[PDB]
Design a protein around this ligand. Structure first.
Ligand SMILES: N=C(N)c1ccc2cc([C@@H]3C[C@H]3c3ccccc3)ccc2c1
Length: 245
């Protein structure tokens, strides 16, 4: 997250931090995700497509720092890794960028809801918030494009939704962004999500309840003029999420 504010997990209880075990023992941070139900976490397919082995992934819930064991955290492995069978990647855009991870602890159980570990609700059919709505994003991603390390403490920020037609303008993303994706950004282009934040939650308060409206997917640079962050529009995939869970 470029700009924004440092935060802690109690402020984002459904945020999942996903790592990957490398041959040798070293572990590096991969992407974020969100808790859908006690046994399921949803993220982005592009975060796993090149290393599809479910055994190498480690998932944490209730974790506040990149290299610290936050009191109350729970560690899990991936029982089933489901990727969208129609996923593809072009020069900038990613298609059907959505994935499902069934989690299980070493004892064989799913997550246990607590003050720092909670699920987020899915959106409903044909009911997404209007352009201009402020929503929040969270992640352990880069604070600047030139940084090679990720911040040690979790961060979050607020950006606003941009209409499909505004996002299809020539200086934005033209026909590269489709009706199955959502754009969001800062009018002053000072804050935004960035590499490292992929797969994380775009949460919008809609008609009262906080909803998982989007999944951090792609974007040209980070916090650049006329180049909004692009997100997978969860409402379109409800039928897919239902059949695969
Ligand atoms: N403007 C933003 N809000 C934004 C959001 C997500 C982003 C994800 C990547 C990570 C690297 C992309 C990638 C491409 C292919 C496969 C792996 C990773 C790069 C830039 C990004 C910018």
């Amino acid at each position: 997250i470029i700009g924004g504010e440092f935060t802690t997990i109690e402020n984002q209880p459904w945020f999942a931090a996903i790592y990957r075990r490398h041959r040798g023992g070293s572990v590096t941070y991969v992407c974020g995700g969100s808790l859908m139900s006690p046994c399921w976490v949803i993220s982005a397919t592009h975060c796993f497509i090149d290393y599809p082995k479910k055994e190498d992934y480690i998932v944490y819930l209730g974790r506040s720092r990149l290299n610290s064991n936050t009191q109350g955290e729970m560690k899990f492995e991936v029982e089933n890794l489901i990727l969208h069978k129609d996923y593809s990647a072009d020069t900038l855009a990613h298609h059907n960028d959505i994935a499902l991870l069934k989690i299980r602890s070493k004892e064989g159980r799913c997550a246990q809801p607590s003050r720092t570990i909670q699920t987020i609700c899915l959106p409903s059919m044909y009911n997404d918030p209007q352009f201009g709505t402020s929503c929040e994003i969270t992640g352990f991603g880069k604070e600047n494009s030139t940084d090679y390390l990720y911040p040690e403490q979790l961060k979050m920020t607020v950006v606003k939704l941009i209409s499909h037609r505004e996002c299809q303008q020539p200086h934005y993303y033209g026909s590269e962004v489709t009706t199955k994706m959502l754009c969001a950004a800062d009018p002053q282009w000072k804050t935004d999500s960035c590499q490292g934040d992929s797969g994380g939650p775009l949460v919008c308060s809609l008609q009262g309840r906080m909803t998982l409206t989007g999944i951090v997917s792609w974007g040209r640079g980070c916090a650049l003029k006329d180049k909004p962050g692009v997100y997978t529009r969860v409402s379109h995939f409800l039928p897919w999420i239902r059949s695969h869970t």
